[PDB]
Amino acid sequence: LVKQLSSNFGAISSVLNDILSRLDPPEAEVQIDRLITGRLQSLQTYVTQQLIRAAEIRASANLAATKMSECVLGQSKRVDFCGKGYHLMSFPQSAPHGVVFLHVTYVPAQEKNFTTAPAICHDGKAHFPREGVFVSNGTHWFVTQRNFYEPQIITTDNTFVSGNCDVVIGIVNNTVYDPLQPE
């Protein structure tokens, strides 16, 4: 924008005082009209560009405000909204013309494979895990979480009964003991 002042836009010069210090008004006015047309057009295009850039900056600022509100003031369940992985918490930092977020996530590392079963038949009635999944190492059956392996002994408080053993596909026989039976 500043440099655009050095172009004559077709006139005899690009400096107003020299233009008006050599010619009569009837022609100085023509030259001055040419320069003012050019300069007005340059200012107009600069302003339009600034408006269009301001729109995008405002969109980015709205996104930043939403992210601050939803991931600094609380824990978010929107995947890949505040970092890759299960989001835990985040910290804001200042910067010139912006912010910086330090997202803290949780990533599982080491996996081992087992065999599963949708249900466990004990006495003609099916059993399903209250929370977690049935797993086995090949000689015994456990129930465990879904994001951190931690086996537990199958019993009557980890499972709930529903229906029979003739409806589910893939059901497997296994014992499910009553804790109050030994006592």
């Binding site: 200012l43 900056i57 013309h97 977020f101």
Partner: protein, 118 residues
């Protein structure tokens, strides 16, 4: 050279045009400088410039069965940065000064154009 064959103008023909100064490679890597239509170039060794097809990454199949599962046993906590601009540099101009700096007749001529300045 963009959208022309190597006839009007070491020398290689691409989907985008005639490429001069690089050696084609059968291998595929990760894109460094995009070229067009899946071609990219990078400076790797005798140092030179090589043009190669983009690769999406490492192939990885998972052993899918119908009674098998995989469960994690150890975890990892990490940190990642996210960067977002917020504000621009604010400014302002004086239209009449910028157009007709210290010239009464120039300002009088400008007066015949309306409310552009406002």
């Amino acid at each position: 050279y963009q959208d022309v064959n190597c006839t009007e103008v070491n020398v290689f023909q691409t989907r985008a045009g005639c490429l001069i100064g690089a050696e084609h490679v059968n291998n595929s890597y990760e894109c460094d400088i995009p070229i067009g239509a899946g071609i990219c170039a990078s400076y790797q060794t005798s140092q030179s410039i090589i043009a190669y097809t983009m690769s999406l990454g490492a192939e990885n199949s998972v052993a899918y069965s119908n009674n098998s599962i995989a469960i994690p046993t150890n975890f990892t906590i990490s940190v990642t940065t996210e960067i977002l601009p917020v504000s621009m540099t604010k400014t302002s101009v004086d239209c009449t000064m910028y157009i007709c700096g210290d010239s009464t007749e120039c300002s009088n001529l400008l007066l015949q154009y309306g409310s552009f300045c406002t």
